[PDB]
């Protein structure tokens, strides 16, 4: 398979890996700022939700929805604190350990390059340069060859001694070049990759820890949103004013009614003088009652028109858009009181008409009772 | 059952209901400010989440989690706008219609009280006061009684005419007091309750509409939080640098190795001069290799100690607390390179020892080849 050890085992590949390490720190630095703003976001939101903040079902329900919204505000504050102390602080540590790996890797990599240069190149070239010198030094003594033997024998002694020292230097250099390009440099690149794949595992876990803490759909947020919805659902509109009427309720205040005062003398006096006054009063009261019944008719036709107009809108309004019907309901409320007064006015004239008609019959064909003055 | 019509049919009960209407507007006014701060809350949070904001699995996953967090920010802005235009604007209208009902109810209620006072009390007292006057006026004419008859006849004509006019006034007053305390005032209180129970239905729907719009656990928020979690879960740590190695990968740069240069003359020359140089070099190289093998042993015992210490911590660390192991892993990384160099150093001395031992045997018991000078 592919790897740093096999594919990036070149001085070019070193530059590639040195840039990745910088580009990955550049990303994780962005991730820190990104997470740090979510800490700022959730805290100010907690502060904004916190600034938002009698036996009625609605008042009891209101007290919960407002109290649970406080519960939300405090939860968003905990999110920011856990995020700050948890995956953010872990991401910071990941950046600090990566900042070491930049130096460690590169100064290790250069340390291996210096060793090879010394054993493979530098040491060899110093052995080579000396092997030339001693070979030339011997060739001079050969030309010059009593004492020419001895000095030529020494020159060959050292040439052969150096030759063998150079052989061993070449074998040491050969096996370094072997262990450099097969084990040392591949072994380093292998270790860098394996650690970077371990730090990919750390970052995934850090990211996933962020998502869980910063979750607005997690079980604890659902638990609050249910408590809120449950409180609103508990509201019974038709049982709103039951508790109200148990405390502030009383028996109807009905004053004493008008009874005919017997200190000024409830029967209509029908005598010879009043008879024609009573006959005219029944004519006029009848005329008034027919106009009062005409008034009742207009106001019932008004009520009926407004009632049927409301039924039509009730059917053609979405249940949450019924706040627009309060206007027409209040106009019907005025029309219904109007009718109720017209009935009271009609009724009054009926009771007056009754007295006149009843007393005018009780006489019937009889002579209007004469006024006796003793 | 209990109701405004039956329990609050008293001037005391009017004061009670006038205060409720104020206390309910006082609540709904608080609900408006409360909701209006949630509009402010969700907009600034959207602004705070907005301010937060290459073929790598993590880079692709990062690009989604950041892009979906933008999707969240925009969603919180829509929440605030819908809340502002929806249940807030509806709550405002509910306050405006209630502000009318305060005036309408009270001025209606006083209009009914004025009618009763007129028909029941005022009109009656004016009929009473006149009935006294005409009764006294007649009693004078009776005492004074030719012309005394005529003037006494007139006084009785009007007394009896007024008596009947007062009878009809009392019957009108009686039936008003009836229709006031049975129909008019109960009918009004009934209508006020029914409308207030309708406005309790409106408020429940307004509150529930708020909760749905302002829901942070609703389906659209879940849809984003899943997309985020799915992106983080997609991250494959061990497939992070596969795409990286396909683009930036190359074949290993292995320079040409050291081969014994034949311009300076790879066999150790074993003659009569070099023999004792070769015998000593194998002694010294052997001494070095035993020290180099001692070095390999120390560094393998160091690697083994650090490997077993890491296995112990790997087992006793929560998977998200593994960022603390990067320190010990990097110390093992240095120990592993240390070992790999010690093996390279050991190996070099082995290859040198081989050449010396192999050449010293190839001679064996033979006479160190003599140096021939032609």
UniProtKB/Swiss-Prot annotation, chains A, B:
<comment type="function">
    <text>Tyrosine-protein kinase that acts downstream of cell surface receptors and plays a role in the regulation of the actin cytoskeleton, microtubule assembly, cell attachment and cell spreading. Plays a role in FCER1 (high affinity immunoglobulin epsilon receptor)-mediated signaling in mast cells. Acts down-stream of the activated FCER1 receptor and the mast/stem cell growth factor receptor KIT. Plays a role in the regulation of mast cell degranulation. Plays a role in the regulation of cell differentiation and promotes neurite outgrowth in response to NGF signaling.</text>
</comment>
<protein>
    <recommendedName>
        <fullName>Tyrosine-protein kinase Fes/Fps</fullName>
    </recommendedName>
</protein>
<feature type="coiled-coil region">
    <location>
        <begin position="114"/>
        <end position="149"/>
    </location>
</feature>
<comment type="subunit">
    <text>Homooligomer. Interacts with BCR. Interacts (when activated, via coiled coil domain) with TRIM28. Interacts (via SH2 domain) with phosphorylated EZR, MS4A2/FCER1B and HCLS1/HS1. Interacts with phosphorylated KIT. Interacts with FLT3. Interacts (via F-BAR domain) with soluble tubulin. Interacts (via SH2 domain) with microtubules.</text>
</comment>
<feature type="modified residue" description="Phosphotyrosine">
    <location>
        <position position="241"/>
    </location>
</feature>
<feature type="region of interest" description="Important for interaction with membranes containing phosphoinositides">
    <location>
        <begin position="2"/>
        <end position="272"/>
    </location>
</feature>
<feature type="modified residue" description="Phosphoserine">
    <location>
        <position position="56"/>
    </location>
</feature>
<comment type="similarity">
    <text>Belongs to the protein kinase superfamily. Tyr protein kinase family. Fes/fps subfamily.</text>
</comment>
<feature type="domain" description="F-BAR">
    <location>
        <begin position="2"/>
        <end position="240"/>
    </location>
</feature>
<feature type="coiled-coil region">
    <location>
        <begin position="296"/>
        <end position="340"/>
    </location>
</feature>
């Amino acid at each position: 398979g592919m790897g740093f050890s096999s594919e990036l085992c070149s001085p070019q590949g070193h530059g590639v890996l040195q840039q990745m390490q910088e580009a990955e720190l550049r990303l994780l630095e962005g991730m820190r700022k990104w997470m740090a703003q979510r800490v700022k976001s959730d805290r100010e939101y907690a502060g904004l939700l916190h600034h938002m903040s009698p036996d009625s079902p609605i008042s009891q329900s209101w007290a919960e929805i407002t109290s649970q919204t406080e519960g939300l505000s405090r939860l968003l504050r905990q999110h920011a604190e856990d995020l700050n102390s948890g995956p953010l602080s872990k991401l910071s540590l990941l950046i600090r350990e990566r900042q070491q790996l930049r130096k460690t890797y590169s100064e290790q990599w250069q340390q291996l390059q210096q060793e090879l240069t010394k054993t493979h190149s530098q040491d060899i070239e110093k052995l080579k340069s000396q092997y030339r010198a001693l070979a030339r030094d011997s060739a001079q003594a050969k030309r010059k060859y009593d004492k020419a033997k001895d000095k030529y024998v020494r020159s060959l002694w050292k040439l052969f001694a150096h030759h063998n020292r150079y052989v061993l230097g070449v074998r040491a250099a050969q096996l370094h070049h072997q262990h450099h390009h097969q084990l040392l440099l591949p072994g380093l690149l292998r270790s860098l990759q394996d650690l970077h794949e371990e730090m990919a595992c750390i970052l995934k876990e850090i990211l996933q820890e962020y998502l869980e803490i910063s979750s607005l759909v997690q079980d604890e947020v659902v638990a609050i949103h249910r408590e809120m919805a449950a409180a609103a659902a508990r509201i019974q509109p038709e049982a709103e004013y039951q508790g109200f009427l148990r405390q502030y309720g009383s028996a109807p205040d009905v004053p004493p009614c008008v009874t005919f005062d017997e200190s000024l003398l409830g029967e209509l006096q029908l005598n010879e003088l009043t008879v024609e006054s009573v006959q005219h009063t029944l004519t006029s009261v009848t005329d008034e009652l027919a106009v009062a019944t005409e008034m009742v008719f207009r106001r019932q036709e008004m009520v009926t028109q407004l009632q049927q107009e409301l039924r039509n809108e009730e059917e053609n309004t979405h249940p949450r858009e019924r706040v627009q019907l309060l206007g027409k309901r209040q106009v019907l409320q005025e029309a219904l009181q109007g009718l109720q007064v017209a009935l009271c006015s009609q009724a009054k004239l009926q009771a007056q008409q009754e007295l006149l008609q009843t007393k005018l019959e009780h006489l019937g064909p009889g002579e209007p009772p004469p006024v006796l003055l003793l």
